Design a protein around this nucleic acid. Structure first.
Lengths: 98, 91
DNA sequence: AAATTTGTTTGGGCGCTGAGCAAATTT
DNA sequence: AAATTTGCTCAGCGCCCAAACAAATTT
């Protein structure tokens, strides 16, 4: 057999820890921190947009990175993301990536 | 002019702010490196699930479990919010 | 020149939607 | 005692979707 890699550890970013040593925390925790400091700020005006705000911030990179990987090939991009080719096209247009 | 950002630290022990989107880029850039052309199959539901959980975990914690307010705080329908809490068994 | 991708358009369905409501809970 | 939030239902419609095609591009 070979060792377990939980869903958390598939997508990870490099962090430095207490002992000045480069570990790899999940992406989850980056999202957590980005939000917790976002809350620190907004004292105390209302929010009516928090989902789309995040979605936007996450979709742009994903599309970006996959389109680099597939080298502009939308057919393959949409295949590997598991979305409709039309849906992908629509999303690319939302972010001016065409 | 940028709401979503994570704290980073450098060579000179200086903390500096960088956007979450840059952090997502790396996460993937890395993920891609690890697989040597092993076709990826559901990369959207993957990333979605890795972001929806922290987001929910947090606003649900901010609104103190008040589903009504958290749904209004995000852009989404209370019913949708419930469907998502179910999806990740957070309910 | 064959194979693949792009850029449309079409229609079925499912997912997100607000509204409505009684019951439970917070105030 | 009143106000808010929950849990559920329910049409409507808006998005996601595969299927199909011809034209453009890549192989």
């Amino acid at each position: 057999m070979f060792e377990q890699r939980v869903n958390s550890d598939v997508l990870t970013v490099s962090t430095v820890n207490s002992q000045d040593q480069v570990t790899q925390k999940p992406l989850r925790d980056s999202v957590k921190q980005a939000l917790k400091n976002y809350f620190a700020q907004l004292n105390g005006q209302d929010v009516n947009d928090l989902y789309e705000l995040v979605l936007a911030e996450v979709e742009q990179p994903l599309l970006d990175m996959v389109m680099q990987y597939t080298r502009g090939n939308q057919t393959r991009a949409a295949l590997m993301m598991g979305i409709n080719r039309g849906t992908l096209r629509k999303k690319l247009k939302k972010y001016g990536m065409n």
